[PDB]
Ligand binder design. Structure first.
Ligand SMILES: O=c1ccc2ccc(F)c3c2n1C[C@H]3CN1CCC(NCc2cc3c(nn2)OCCO3)CC1
Ligand SMILES: [Mn+2]
Ligand SMILES: [Mn+2]
Lengths: 189, 481, 483, 189
DNA sequence: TGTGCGGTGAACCTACGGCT
DNA sequence: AGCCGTAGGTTCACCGCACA
């Protein structure tokens, strides 16, 4: 499933995570296969904050990402074995894409936390007004979102480890009420 | 260029949470619809797929809805449309479908290329006068189309068909109701703003499921009507009968709402095999299109079939509870509403719709009258009218002369010029006059309605009463003490 | 209807399936070069005004209208068929304009139809040009609720230009694409010499021209194919040998053979190195980019002869693949194996028929218009009389009858006078009508002139063909090396 | 995938073969579940004339038909073990449905020939004007094609074995020329 | 633990000719 | 061998909440 790049020097390599093959096509045609790797998934991924340890390790998409990064998870994590110095989350520019980002972020924080601390995780910024990346022409996706010259990548930074633990538990955790309260307090119509 | 992980999580998840709440899983209190359902119905309306016309292709329907209003998966759109056509899911179906549209056994519908659909006669009541400025239109997802924000909904659809929705941080579960009871309830409310739940319950006895069956007690219904939350125990319609000679059987002809019949049967078989239940010698689904739902459960000779039945209620979906949780969008926001609140918001929506329609019919009537007054002047001085046009080199000069000489507006002058020669015949000249007189009475009739709030409210009552008589039916679900 | 013999059932069900596949699915028509699926697509795009000047229209809507009205088959067959016509690596002259993910040479499928949008290409307008001027026969659709075209005007030799490949029952077809400038020149020489030979035609049409460029080896295979409709043509990739540093060399491929999957070709090359069925290769990379273009790199080991490795690669991998020409196409609704001339002949006869039927249509339309104008001239010259005649009449029927007898008018002339608006009575309309009528008389004469002389009609086809050539004709892409 | 009937008496039992679930849905809703079994297949089935045994015994649809009939194949075929006395081919009323019928008959002839000789194989006659069975309402399918009181079923007859052997070879076999010759000599355009 | 319903996402059979 | 391209067919991963 992973469409890897030419170079094997992680310092200059990057891996874009997309929603699927409809998006993956525009991505593969528009990239630089020398330094830009692409791993298309299959939509909404497993929520690690609600699922059991054994279920997570058996999940097909979860394994592909770990195999792609080559660092292992939890206690067996090793940053020196990282295959890419830039893991780029590039979901579709819609509400369901924003949700998938949170799902991936949740995954990176609970099993590959040091990857976020080292500044390896990035958030791509595709243009609004597109239902998906498969709706865009290869060139317009490259110039606006993937081209190192003109793209605005957002680096994920971890500030407070206490506030972060409370955020992921609140939004992605098994307790509904806390999540309902958050919505009530922050909702703007 | 830098993004804090805590902020990203809070903003993106809120963005998604809000969107599912206000534009996906929760229905509006006014039309009782979700965005996908409203977009499907509107699509059928704009394409003129009315019940008098022939069945149109599901593929074209779904294809148009998706492109114009619903920027989502085609499978979601098609499956929502199919559900609206199923007489076991919708108390008052909204889609009239031709072909394979699924079963009570969980079988899906045939691929969209094979099936065809149109509106049912009742759906016309949801769309009635949607083009008479009754409801507010909004921009679609891309600024290229226009879509309704809500439907006229000339019958209380939210409570009639109910709704189920899983969102974020909340969910919804509203049961369907009998249309005759709802409208009667609405009529009482309009005559008494301070009516109580208890009194409204004299009209609305409780939920009425498309799959009939039984409800046990009035406590669960009362709790739900009062608070918006409550547990209602549903039960299958089951009888015990002889089958010779000395042997008996349990016959089921109605199952609980939303229960999969095939699934229910397997669950019974599982228990028989696992020896978790005693006395069952055979289990057969005799259901037929011709004979209706019929599930047969053979009992062992001399065993008490009444004891076996009671056990089936405890261990199988033969008895299932419906957990009411009445959350709907009120003024755009999710809210837990009671029976009265739901009826109040619907009544108030009906008043605005009828007033807006009257105001629209008035404006258009006046505009037409003005145009007719222009043509009437023209017919009275047709000779003079010709001479003015004949001596004019251009249309612009003709216009200006017509306005000047006959004291006409710009619109009146244009209408005379657009007038064809055939309009001059005996019968055609009489049509222009006949229409004008009818229109003056009509204008007067509409002004009488706007000048009195009580007359308007009475019209709302009379129009609701008309629908009750035509679409109202008998209660299906039995409520036992 | 109690019984059915197994043998009789097998023969009659099978022939029914086979006949349908042959005449209504897998084989292209010699006149417009299209299979029903594609013709129905292009027609659907035309009926909804999905022209090049208009914005892109949603793919799902396209597929859905085509499926409902003309093509009662699965949506995937329709979509994927539209997708192909939009690819510059599949169609020598694309017939569809696409926006979004529309596949790749690496075998990637297009994005789901909900994401993509499409429209007609400028060259497609030429296929549909004059479709609403009674040039071609329309037929009832599958259910009888719609009408569709049996064939398109095809103002350019589409069958040979874009070619085709189809697998039917009992037969198959494989027609390669060609250069439009070359094709039109051939058609021109043919229209000037019905006895023109194959060898003489090849002075214009040098051989196939692939959207993927590349090379062709020899002319014998090409000659055989044109002469008989069958032949084996050797396609070869464009590859060069260049230096990479330190006395080491590499092979660089910038163009591959038609219909060859790049990623799949590369994988087979990697397989040979891994299984040791070839030596001298140290690395294999695919450096293809939008900016760079197709670029496959094959690093050779220092001091190893790179030309030998290349030669072996041609023999052992799809870096050199043959195109088996088998030119079967529908001629009067029958499958028929045809040569280069016979293809050009049937196309030219289709063009002669289209342009003739067009001139005949314009002639009827003009005579009808001149007839109406004569009725309007009488009306305006005696307007007062006309108006009183209408006013004194109670119904429309009465007015029509009075107008016909009093003013010597036909039923159509009387009707057009009744449909006439009051603004048509202005001071300059009477002269405006006189001008149009005179122009029409002159125009009618010009059309009759053409239909009375077969040489003026044929020459007209030539001019319109030449016009297509100059506006859409391009340079040859595939190089033919001898030998 | 098999949707069986209540009765276990094969003399009065019958099994309908449809192209898939879209057709199977209308069929299950309109059938008499007491004596009518339903087996939805998966479109075009393998041509046994062009395939070798290993390929045949491993095809899912072939296996389910064998399992459903309960007769076995070839020399092990036992007619006394049939679960239905009426095997009804009910493919869609289109040219591709006609082709699936030929593919099914081919299979029945090469592996269950005595089943035909006994008159156990029938051909349904759904009305034309429909792309598939899924397009019809359950009642319309029942009354015109499935109801024994009104339906017209075509019983398959074997006249001459030698001619039948040749017909199956010519049309379904690997030699394209014979099949091309048949088309030419019998095609009426 | 599994289900109801609008959402994100995608795969792999087969026929056919030629080479609570 | 598989693979070129129009055809017939369909299955299973995930989210979210509240009920037994
Ligand atoms: O990816 C996968 C992977 C596996 C798999 C298995 C079984 C299975 F069934 C499927 C699978 N899939 C996908 C799915 C098969 N698809 C094919 C195409 C079919 N098209 C619908 C459609 C769309 C339209 C339209 N009409 N009809 O017109 C209006 C706009 O768009 C929808 C089902
Ligand atoms: Mn997406
Ligand atoms: Mn079919």
């Amino acid at each position: 499933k992973l469409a890897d790049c030419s170079s094997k020097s992680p310092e200059e390599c990057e891996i874009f995570l997309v929603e699927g093959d409809s998006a993956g096509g525009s991505t593969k045609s528009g990239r630089d296969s020398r330094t830009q790797a692409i791993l298309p998934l299959r939509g909404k991924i497993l929520n690690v904050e609600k699922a059991r340890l054994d279920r997570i390790l058996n999940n097909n998409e979860i394994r592909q990402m770990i195999t792609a990064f080559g660092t292992g998870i939890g206690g067996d994590f090793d940053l020196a074995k990282a295959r890419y110095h830039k893991i780029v989350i590039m979901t579709d520019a819609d509400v369901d894409g924003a949700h998938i980002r949170t799902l991936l972020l949740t995954f990176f924080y609970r099993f590959m936390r040091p990857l976020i601390e080292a500044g390896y995780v990035y958030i791509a910024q595709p243009p609004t007004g597109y239902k998906g990346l498969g709706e865009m022409n290869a060139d317009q996706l490259w110039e606006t979102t993937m081209n190192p010259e003109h793209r605005a990548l957002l680096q994920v930074k971890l500030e407070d480890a206490i506030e972060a633990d409370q955020t992921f538990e609140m939004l992605m955790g098994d307790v509904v009420e806390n999540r309902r309260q958050f919505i009530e307090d922050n909702a703007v119509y | 260029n830098e993004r804090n992980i805590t902020s990203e999580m809070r903003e993106s998840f809120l963005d998604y949470a809000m969107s599912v709440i206000v534009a996906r899983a929760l229905p509006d209190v006014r039309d009782g619809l979700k965005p996908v359902h409203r977009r499907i119905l509107y699509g059928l309306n704009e394409q003129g797929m009315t019940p008098d016309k022939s069945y149109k292709k599901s593929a074209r329907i779904v294809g148009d809805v998706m492109g114009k209003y619903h920027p989502h998966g085609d499978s979601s759109i098609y499956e929502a449309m199919v559900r609206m056509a199923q007489d076991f899911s919708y108390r008052y179906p909204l889609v009239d479908g031709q072909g394979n549209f699924g079963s009570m056994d969980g079988d899906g519908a045939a691929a969209m290329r094979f099936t065809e659909a149109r509106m049912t006669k009742i759906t016309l009541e949801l769309l009635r006068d949607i083009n008479k400025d009754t409801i507010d239109f909004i921009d679609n997802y891309d600024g290229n189309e226009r879509e309704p924000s809500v439907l006229p909904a000339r019958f209380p659809n939210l409570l009639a068909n109910g709704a189920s929705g899983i969102a974020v941080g909340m969910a919804t579960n509203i049961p369907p109701h009998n249309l005759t009871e709802l409208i009667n309830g609405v009529l009482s409310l309009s005559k008494n703003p301070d009516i109580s739940i208890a009194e409204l319950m004299e009209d609305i006895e409780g939920p009425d499921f498309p799959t009939a069956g039984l409800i046990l007690g009035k406590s669960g219904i009362r709790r739900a009507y009062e608070t918006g939350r409550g547990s209602i125990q549903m039960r299958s319609r089951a009888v015990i009968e002889e089958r010779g000679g000395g042997r008996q059987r349990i016959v089921v002809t109605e199952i609980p709402f939303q229960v999969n019949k095939a699934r229910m049967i397997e669950k019974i078989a599982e228990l028989v095999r696992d020896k978790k239940i005693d006395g069952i010698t055979d289990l057969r689904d005799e259901t037929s299109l011709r004979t209706g739902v019929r599930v047969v459960i053979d009992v062992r000779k001399d065993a008490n079939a009444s004891v076996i039945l009671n056990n089936l209620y405890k261990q199988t979906p033969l008895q299932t509870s419906f957990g009411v949780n009445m959350i709907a969008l009120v003024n755009g926001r999710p809210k837990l509403i009671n029976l009265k609140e739901a009826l109040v918001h619907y009544l108030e929506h009906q008043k605005t719709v009828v007033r807006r329609r009257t105001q629209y019919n008035l404006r258009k009537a006046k505009d037409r009258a003005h145009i007719l007054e222009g043509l009437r002047i023209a017919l009275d001085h047709i000779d003079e009218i010709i001479s003015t046009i004949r001596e004019s080199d251009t249309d612009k000069v003709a216009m200006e002369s017509l306005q000047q000489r006959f004291k006409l507006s710009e619109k009146q002058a244009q209408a005379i010029l657009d007038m064809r020669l055939r309009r001059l015949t005996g019968l055609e000249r009489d049509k222009i006059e006949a229409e004008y007189n009818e229109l003056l009475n009509y204008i007067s009739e509409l002004e009488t309605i706007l000048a009195d709030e009580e007359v308007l409210l009475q019209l709302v009552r009379d129009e609701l009463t008309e629908i009750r008589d035509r679409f109202g039916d008998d209660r299906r679900t039995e409520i036992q003490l």
